[PDB]
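new request in #modeling-help
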Amino acid sequence: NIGKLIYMDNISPEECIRRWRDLEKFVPYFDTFEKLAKKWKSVDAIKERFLTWYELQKAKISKQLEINNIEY
Amino acid sequence: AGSQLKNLKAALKARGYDREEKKKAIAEIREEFNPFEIKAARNKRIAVGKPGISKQIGEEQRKRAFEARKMMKNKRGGVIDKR
Amino acid sequence: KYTTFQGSQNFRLRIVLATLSGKPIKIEKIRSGDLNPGLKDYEVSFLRLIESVTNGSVIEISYTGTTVIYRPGIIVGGASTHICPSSKPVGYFVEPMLYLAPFSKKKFSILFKGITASHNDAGIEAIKWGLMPVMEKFGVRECALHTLKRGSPPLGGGEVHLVVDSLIAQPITMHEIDRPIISSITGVAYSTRVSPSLVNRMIDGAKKVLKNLQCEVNITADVWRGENSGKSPGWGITLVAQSKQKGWSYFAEDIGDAGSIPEELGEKVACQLLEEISKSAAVGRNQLPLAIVYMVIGKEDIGRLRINKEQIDERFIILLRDIKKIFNTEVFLKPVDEADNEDMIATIKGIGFTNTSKKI
Amino acid sequence: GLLVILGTRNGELQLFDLASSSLLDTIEDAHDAAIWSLDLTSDGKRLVTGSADKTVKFWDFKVLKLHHDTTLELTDDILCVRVSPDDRYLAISLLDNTVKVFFLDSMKFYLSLYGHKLPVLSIDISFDSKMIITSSADKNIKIWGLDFGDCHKSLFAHQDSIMNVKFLPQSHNFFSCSKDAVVKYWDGEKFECIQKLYAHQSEVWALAVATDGGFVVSSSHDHSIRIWEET
Amino acid sequence: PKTQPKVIRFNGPSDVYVPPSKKTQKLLRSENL
Amino acid sequence: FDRTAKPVPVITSEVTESLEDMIRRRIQDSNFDDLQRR
RNA sequence: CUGGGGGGAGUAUGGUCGCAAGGCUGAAACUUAAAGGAA
């Protein structure tokens, strides 16, 4: 759904996000500081994010090739 | 006649928590009691040039010209500002 | 002949991807319906920086200034200096050089001269601690942003020595099918031309917000004394969260201005960082552009990187549309096979990129 | 006009007027110890009293009587207060060699200006509320920029002690009278000394500038009060 | 009916005493007889 | 082309200023390389 | 209470890892007090 929305290129990007639910500015969009203060007064939301040579090269490239197939 | 040192001590007693008066007085006595950076001719009937200042502008001019040519030397592009 | 874009959005990314791909572009209608229409001075000086970095690229600005023609050339690098204007800091010009940086004849040794920081741009600590590690594990190994002196706005007067000296062939294919465990959380609180107590006030505010998570918080402190302080008073704070087993990092920064409480700014940057951790998965919302750019100019293989639901936005998909508009490649968002969260894994098959400027 | 607030050496404050007799009211136990400096707000309805009992207090005018409502206790003997001329900042000079700038609307602790190296007398805030002065017994006045709390000059005047320092109404020029029988006229742009006025004989305890126009009176230890106008 | 607030204003001369002197200066660039 | 020796230096105001403040540093620290009477 | 590199006396070092200089202190965002040092 989302890939077809992204590459369907006759609709605006905010319309893609709207029917799914600008880079000179480097730092991304954040909320107001007051909304973020009441949102992150709690902390428990993200506590689980917190806490021979020749055959070796051939094994790395065959690992990449099987990744290629199983993702194709 | 009298010494440049005697005239310099007299000029300091003349000029004497303000700052800009001292900046002005120091710059005045420096460019007055420095006679080897002007050039004086003799009037046959007199400051006629400023050698060090003319030299430094003539060599800074060709210094920026030389750096500009060294910047140009192996370029091939250029923006074309038609504005 | 020319791939045509409209509007003055994503301007640096368009010129950067045109330099990478070697495709002549036109950007039309640079703010044409405006009172002072056309290109602005900071993006004109960015064009001058592109002419400094490359060689044989012809840029052709129009009469009205509202359309530009970029016919790219070979990235050659060399040593340079860039006196960027007061409208944008040095981060606005060193951010798009990190894409072109490892793909040149001679290594990048540039020093930018101007304002160091801005509210809406990248800082020295942002560029260094956030954007250098993603290049450091995408394949480069010797890259360094040095501060020789830094200048807070409005007068600035700070110089920044960007030196990259690993000229790789192409970036490696990324494989991040995990969410990296955050091992530590560090940072840097800087202040120039003000009292040294503001830094400790910023650090204490950030760490009193951070104190309830059971990790380890460490914020380093630098006041800048002397000629290294620049021409204006300023202070700011940049936190990173550090996954040490792989090297990943998630950053957030800001700067204070005339009338700003340092404990307020410290707790604001702390909460903004925790929200970046929330809305992040293996990248940041601002480290994501050059991450997927290096994935798309990697080898001719599949490289896959995990992202979450909230990192998709109009900026991210206008990036993807510009990527496909220039060199005709798509991303494939496959979802993960476990359902306590909404994370895609973006697989990009990279184009067959090599750097052909480095002499053999 | 026609109404005077005053604080005394002991814990007492007092109010008088011009038409009627002395005492509107006194407030016994206005403070626990010696009061040191008070300041009205620019509308006058709310005044600030800082005293040597390590406290400042705020008072309102209820109808013509004084209403104590809030009190900020510090760690150290506050000995000068001032507000900005546009109700914006509250700068208070402590005995601990520093001043603190607060926001009146929050008691926010905006700034701490530090580095004077003796206990610090009179403050003044400029008309644009951008530039403060800071006098002390270190024989020098410091100019501070209030936006970031950054110092500008540290000019050494007055070889005994600067008792008071006051701006002009509309300009960044200011006056400072000191404990060595001299008042001094400065500018806040070149930081020169405009004038060195030499009429007193002993310790000049206070000076006050006109609200508009700018003629300044100075009053001293030799029981003298003298006016200073323009040429 | 008094509203008694407190204050604390610790000074940070040690933050300049622990500036880039040695460690941060080096790190902020990356028998008998 | 390559050239044999460096030319004689032109004496401008910058080099006289640098030389004079060198002299001023020496003359206010009394760093004088005089002969000392035996 | 079993485990071992390779002679003695030196010398050099554009390699790697360290430790180390400046320069009156106070004193910097402030050309700023007292006091001390030096001569």
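bot summary: Chain A is about 55% helix and 0% strand.
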